[PDB]
């Protein structure tokens, strides 16, 4: 049963038990994960912002990529929190990129459906793409912003 | 060490 439970593992139950938001790498150099946050924690708490995370060639780093000279140890850096959405916030010595836009270094901006993040820009050859996706599950349950206070 | 670069500032001119 393994066999196709391996499969349908794919189908079956989507992904998102707290997930807030997910790095896929397209050019092929960063392996994909998964970055979430707690919905009671970010509901429950109000703040400035709840949960960031930092992606670089730190092994600290919530993100860690291959070894790129050209990205710093912690190349850029999400955050979530506001009310129901989410922020990039660019952290690199070289600066961080979307869609082949510069932005402004630690700089929050608002996250967009599939958007996608290049970094170590200078040569052609030496730049690295990333790609967000962000969790549907999550923003339903953010959307809604409602205490489940009903029996 | 010379001087390894952890990461380039990119030496725009």
């Known amino acids: 049963a393994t066999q196709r439970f391996l499969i349908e593992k794919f189908s079956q139950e989507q992904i998102g038990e707290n997930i807030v938001c997910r790095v896929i790498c397209t050019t092929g150099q960063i392996p994909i994960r998964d970055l979430s946050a707690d919905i009671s924690q970010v509901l429950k708490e109000k703040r400035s912002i709840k949960k960031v995370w930092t992606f670089g060639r730190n092994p600290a780093c919530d993100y860690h990529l291959g070894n790129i000279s050209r990205l710093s140890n912690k190349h850029f850096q999400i955050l979530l929190g506001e009310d129901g959405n989410l922020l990039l916030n660019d952290i690199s010595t070289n600066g961080t990129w979307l869609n082949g836009q510069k932005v402004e270094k630690n700089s929050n901006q608002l996250l967009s459906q599939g958007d996608e993040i290049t970094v170590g820009v200078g040569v052609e050859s030496d730049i690295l793409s990333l790609v967000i996706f962000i969790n549907d599950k999550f923003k339903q349950c953010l959307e809604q912003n409602k205490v489940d206070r009903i029996r | ?13």
């Open chain 2, 1 to 13: 060490k010379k001087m390894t670069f952890q990461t380039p500032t990119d030496p725009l001119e």
